[PDB]
Amino acid sequence: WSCSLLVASLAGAFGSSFLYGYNLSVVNAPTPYIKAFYNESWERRHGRPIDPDTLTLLWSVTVSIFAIGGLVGTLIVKMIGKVLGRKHTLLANNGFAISAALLMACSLQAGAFEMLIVGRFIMGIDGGVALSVLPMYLSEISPKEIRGSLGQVTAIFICIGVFTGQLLGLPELLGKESTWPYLFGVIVVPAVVQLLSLPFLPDSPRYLLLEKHNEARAVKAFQTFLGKADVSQEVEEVLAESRVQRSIRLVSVLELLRAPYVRWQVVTVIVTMACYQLCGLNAIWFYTNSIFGKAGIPPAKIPYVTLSTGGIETLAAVFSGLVIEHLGRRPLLIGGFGLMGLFFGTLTITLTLQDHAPWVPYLSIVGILAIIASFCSGPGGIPFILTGEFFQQSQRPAAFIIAGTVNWLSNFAVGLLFPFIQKSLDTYCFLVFATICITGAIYLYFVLPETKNRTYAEISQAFSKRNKAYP
């Protein structure tokens, strides 16, 4: 690790992936203060009291509109593309962080709830651009040897994000009635720490070479990031890979959907990216204090009990790299969803029988933590790995548009509908996510071929038995 690699990794992640992670969990602890604000805004404007279902929908829309933001941000990066480059896209992205932080913080003084819904949206766009461009920047600046580790660095900083959102939301810090607006206002600090540190670092040495046509700057950026003088072999490797890629005509998104000779690869990506979100793990970040409230945890303990959920996620994310190298993709993904489906089962039992003995509610804490540990040890990482292993370099750009679209639309549906599932099914609300985890696991047991240490020529031949077609 040279000097500039650390500051690029730390200031890159802190202003980008950490803010995505923070924005999942920040919304949990101020929930009763924000709903009281919506209520007292609505009656004062319309002259008639708000009804429980309207107030539940406004809160569900506030929580989930962030995912429609993220979808817009994932599509904006295609339009920006060649124009800015990887550093300047991450700098310019702070226009959305700072504007959204100020819209959400000043919503209560304005006396308008629309500012908080519009602020969550723009903060979503930020998170969509952040997660699309930071993996590009970090893999492009880094030495060849460590590009494998950095898919885990953008995962760890999301977890330190969800933990920090849960930490500031304690009633001893900012999660009080008189200081909830600062939970959103503090998002200015990650943005300003990035804006003050990224401009001193070099732009990506591939972008400078391929897309900006400036070889002298590309050499100087390689020399800065790698910390050596003779970077000749680094430049020629990037020119070689470009001379290869220039020969390739990309398969368009509608053409990838229509092609029969990739049908079960497309269907396996859609089903896996759906179950990755619809397994309801985001409903644990957006709604934790309500879940522990219904579970019968004493009202005074809930803020400190919730803080263990971001803790175990961060522990499991740090050791995630030691599991994914050992087991291979098929038993981690099947056994990951398979275990979550079991622990949503026992969670449903311990929520239902919570009145039978005073120790039973605490078993629902162990239940929720075993769900979080089961996801991050396996399913947390593998869907984006598989989407690469299934498709050629000509197909791979389009495959990640499908995979990313299905991801954000599924995150929206969980964020929006979970409070209505809790209303309707009451204590059995987790049997929905049990059914989705087990239905996903059973699909992958029958369809998914083993991909660890295997070539595209073997994996595509394994799918060919059910595609019944060839290029």
Ligand X SMILES: *[C@@H]1O[C@H](CO)[C@@H](O[C@@H]2O[C@H](CO)[C@@H](O)[C@H](O)[C@H]2NC(C)=O)[C@H](O)[C@H]1NC(C)=O
Q: What span, in angstroms and rounded, lies between the C-alpha atoms of 246 and 393?
A: 11
Residue placing its CB nearer to ligand X in the complex, 392 or 424: 424
Binding residues for ligand X restricted to 230-249, rule: CB under 6 A: none
Residue 119 CB, nearest distance to ligand X (Å)?
22
Shortest Å, Cβ 464 to ligand X: 57
* Residue 22-41 contact track with ligand X, rule CB under 6 A, x = bound: -----------------x--
Minimum distance, C-beta of residue 448 to ligand X, in the bound complex (Å): 46
Site string for ligand X, 288-327 (x = CB under 6 A): ----------------------------------------
User: Distance from first CA to last CA of the chain, Å, rounded?
Assistant: 44
Q: Contact with ligand X (CB under 6 A): which of 50, 173, 192, 238?
A: 50
Cβ closer to ligand X: 56 or 467? 56
Span near ligand X by CB under 6 A; candidates 47-55, 253-261, 307-315, 373-381: 47-55
Phi and psi angles of residue 176, each rounded to the nearest 5 degrees, phi first = -100, 165
**Token couple for 299:** 């009202």
Sign of CA dihedral 280, 281, 286, 290: positive
| Residue number with CB closer to ligand X (39 or 179) | 39
Nearer to ligand X, 50 or 402 (CB): 50
Nearer to ligand X, 53 or 450 (CB): 53
Nearer to ligand X, 52 or 358 (CB): 52
Residue 307 phi, psi (nearest 5): -60, -20
CB of 50 to ligand X, least distance (A): 5
C-beta of 106: minimal distance to ligand X in Å? Answer: 23
Rg (CA), the chain: 23
We find the least distance from the C-beta atom of residue 117 to ligand X, in angstroms, to be 18
Q: How far apart are CA 199 and CA 202, in angstroms?
A: 8
Task: Report the nearest approach of ligand X to the CB of residue 425 (Å).
Answer: 21
Apex CA 418: angle with CA 446 and CA 275, to 5°? 15
User: Which one of 52, 299, 358, 471 is in contact with ligand X (CB under 6 A)?
Assistant: 52
List C-alpha distances in Å: 156 to 18, 93, 303: 9, 21, 22
Q: Which stretch binds ligand X (CB under 6 A): 44-52, 198-206, 429-437, 450-458?
A: 44-52
Instruction: State the minimum distance, in angstroms, from the CB of residue 37 to ligand X.
Output: 10
Alpha helices, DSSP H, located in 287-358: 288-294, 302-318, 320-324, 329-352
CB nearer to ligand X: give 37 or 418. Answer: 37
What 3-state class would DSSP assign to 18? helix
Instruction: Specify whether the CB–CB gap between 389 and 330 falls below 8 A.
Output: no
Q: How far is CA 352 from CA 84, 188, 345, 424, 437, in A?
A: 54, 42, 11, 15, 20
Q: Report the alpha-carbon distance of residue 275 to residue 437 in Å, rounded.
A: 7
Q: Does residue 250 touch ligand X according to CB under 6 A?
A: no
Count of residues that interact with ligand X, criterion CB under 6 A: 5
Distances 171 to 141, 178, 387 between C-alpha atoms, Å? 41, 11, 42
CB 33 to ligand X: min, Å:
12
Nearer to ligand X, 30 or 361 (CB): 30
- Interface residues for ligand X in 98-137 (CB under 6 A)? none
Indicate the residue among 52 and 299 with the shorter CB distance to ligand X. Answer: 52
CB closer to ligand X, 37 vs 433: 37
Q: How far is the CB of 53 from ligand X (least distance, A)?
A: 8
CA pair distance 412, 96, nearest whole angstrom:
20
**DSSP label at residue 48:** S
Give residues 54-83 in contact with ligand X (rule: CB under 6 A).
Answer: 55
Tokens found for residue 407 = 């991801």
Of all residues in the shown chain, the one whose CB is closest to ligand X is 39
Residue among 255, 271, 251, 277 nearest 448 (CA): 271
Min dist CB 34 to ligand X, Å, is: 12
Nearer to ligand X, 51 or 325 (CB): 51
Which range touches ligand X (CB under 6 A), out of 24-32, 46-54, 62-70, 194-202? 46-54
Contacts of residue 320, Cβ cutoff 8 Å, sequence gap at least 6: 152, 155, 376, 377, 380, 381
Q: How far apart are CA 7 and CA 5, in angstroms?
A: 6
Please give the Cα distance from 55 to 419 (Å, whole number).
11
| Contacting residues toward ligand X, per CB under 6 A | 39, 50-52, 55
